[PDB]
Design a protein around this ligand. Structure first.
Ligand SMILES: O=C(O)c1ccc[n+]([C@@H]2O[C@H](COP(=O)([O-])O)[C@@H](O)[C@H]2O)c1
Ligand SMILES: O=C(O)c1ccc[n+]([C@@H]2O[C@H](COP(=O)([O-])O)[C@@H](O)[C@H]2O)c1
Ligand SMILES: Cc1ccc(O)c(N)c1
Ligand SMILES: Cc1ccc(O)c(N)c1
Lengths: 346, 346
């Protein structure tokens, strides 16, 4: 893992400079396409894209797992929904499946810790049948976290060898907004009350209990904010670790990764803490309706492109933003040039 | 025109109720897809869509015209850029062409008042070679405004008869952010300084002159805020009138219209003033980087889906948001149902 993190490539400033120059010469007032131009330049700096903003195959990786903390009453969804929904993922009937199809992306469902029998058709990387209840102890051991990071990292960069150039990250796990809130609180240093949300329709009353659970998880585990792996293993979950692993793998592969909602933000905070070199490869999609979204994004210094008040998860937001990445590529390669039309602007 | 405005259909509450019920039963926590769900319901209420969120053919109508107020030094772009760019539109090399292609939409370039010889391949509906300089008088007569509204309205609803179910509106005209700022100031009652922006890269110094021009236009013409046609004819332009006409035509046709940037916001304010029944058919795309965008959107009570800091115009933002409308339709029709998976949520 030390090797993996040491080999993450830095962005290519040379390709980025050539990109900027080419964009400024396009048939439009300089900088008029705003964030679409900055996005194109960002992509140009990613070594896996061959010095140019391009999109080949697209894949959304969905990490599924159950959480022990579900027993603390922090989630109203039946625990079996994780297993049932994971199955539905293979049938193409879920939100991310429908949105990924529209974007022409393929969905990879990965079981990293569902508490049920193996689901055929789902990639099997399960660490255990659900992680430990973070309210009374750690979610898993440091070794288990590191191994899963390694495993998912390799799987991710291996897909690149098959044509994939754009990744989307998602998750599925009842009660996972609780460990997500805990991680955000630890990494940003915010009080649990400011970062704990309603998740998948938790009643407004039950919120207090959720906040107490988050506080208890932190107190009992004493996770070290300066060590993202320590935080993940103590108050995270298998699905959160998996998402972090996709981010490290894509970065090592020098390829772009589209974030999704609140759960992915917590995973990205862990990833950037573990390896700052990962940040240049992260691309925001939407602004999650989860309460702690604003704080999490502020520490990641990211401004999402889409404001859809979405809070489904599954990587549905990542899929929805893929057309945007393709649009920046289309602008870059298909627009005409000012000089060719004899247009001169001051 | 009185007939046209009197025949705009009200939204179908019955179809909308059936839509909401169907969405609530989808494979996800109720309301978790946020604005995507509200958008699907909105579309279901539009009589031209056959009681269901659907998208057939897509078209972006680009209204091109020159403005007399260009002579007041409010724009740094050479005036001929309108004519040159209009030509480029027919060659598919402009920003809206590239983005429309990506969304699978067709671009209709309409000349409603370019100050140059006719451009082959462009729809000819020119009122005159540029409109009057709003700084010293009206842009056009009330009759000219009404006729163009009628003309564009019919052209728009006629396209519907050919399969088009989703419209996007755009414009092209050097100096048009000046009359746009004037209209916004009049309709919202905001001071010119709060609504005048840099347009297509106007230097920060020249801003004062632009503000004075806007104030002079209003003072000299004394447009009546309660009469959108009066405002359009006095301190508007041919391109702005044309965009308003697309909105009235789509509404009469009971079909959805995606707005673009700042220029389209001013046209939408005029449209809603002329006929409030038009509002239910308007769909925002992005949040323009133009200074007066916030104020204009607030009076339209709209919250854009995309924050791309774009300010190109041409209808490029409308095209970029088309995939979003298609996504709401895909969600509605392709997602599985909770009941079928035996999932029960409180
Ligand atoms: O992605 C988000 O922003 C998001 C926000 C709120 C809830 N969710 C989803 O709902 C689940 C977590 O909610 P909860 O109440 O069980 O903690 C999980 O399966 C996520 O996919 C996802
Ligand atoms: O759509 C916007 O929000 C937008 C914001 C600023 C500038 N523009 C474009 O630039 C032109 C108006 O800018 P200007 O400086 O000539 O008044 C016109 O041709 C528009 O297409 C468009
Ligand atoms: C080149 C150029 C200058 C100004 C504009 O508004 C556009 N669309 C294009
Ligand atoms: C049905 C259901 C319940 C909770 C969830 O997070 C999802 N995706 C789906």
């Amino acid at each position: 893992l030390h090797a993996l993190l040491r080999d993450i490539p830095a962005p290519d400033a040379e390709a980025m400079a050539r990109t900027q120059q080419h964009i400024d010469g396009l048939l439009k007032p300089p900088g008029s396409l705003g964030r679409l131009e900055t996005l194109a330049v960002q992509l140009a700096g990613m070594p896996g894209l061959n010095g140019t903003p391009q999109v080949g195959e697209k894949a959304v990786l969905v990490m599924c797992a159950d959480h022990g903390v579900w027993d603390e009453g922090v989630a109203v969804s039946p625990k079996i929904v994780t297993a049932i929904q994971a199955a539905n993922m293979t049938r193409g009937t879920t939100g991310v499946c429908v949105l990924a199809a529209q974007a022409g992306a393929k969905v990879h469902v990965i079981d990293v810790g569902i508490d049920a029998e193996p689901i055929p058709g789902v990639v099997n990387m399960r660490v255990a049948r659900g992680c430990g209840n973070i309210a009374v102890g750690p979610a898993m051991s440091r070794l288990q976290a590191e191994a899963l990071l390694l495993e998912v990292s390799r799987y991710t960069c291996d897909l690149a060898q098959r044509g994939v150039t754009l990744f989307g990250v998602g998750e599925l796990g009842m009660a996972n907004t609780t460990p997500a809130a805990a991680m955000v609180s630890v990494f940003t240093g915010s009080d649990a009350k400011e970062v704990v949300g309603i998740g998948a329709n938790l009643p407004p009353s039950r919120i207090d209990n959720k906040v107490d659970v988050v506080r208890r998880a932190i107190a009992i585990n004493q996770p070290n904010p300066r060590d993202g792996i320590d935080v993940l293993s103590k108050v995270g979950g298998f699905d959160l670790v998996g998402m972090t692993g996709v981010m490290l793998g894509a970065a090592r592969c020098g390829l772009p990764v589209l974030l999704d909602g609140f759960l992915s933000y917590s995973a990205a905070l862990a990833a950037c803490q573990i390896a700052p070199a990962v940040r240049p490869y992260l691309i925001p999609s939407h602004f999650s309706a989860e309460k702690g979204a604003r704080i999490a994004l502020a520490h990641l210094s990211m401004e999402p492109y889409l404001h859809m008040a979405m809070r489904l998860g599954e990587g549905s937001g990542a899929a929805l933003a893929m057309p945007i990445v393709e649009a920046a590529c289309a602008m870059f390669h298909n627009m005409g040039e000012l000089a060719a039309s004899n247009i001169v602007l001051p």
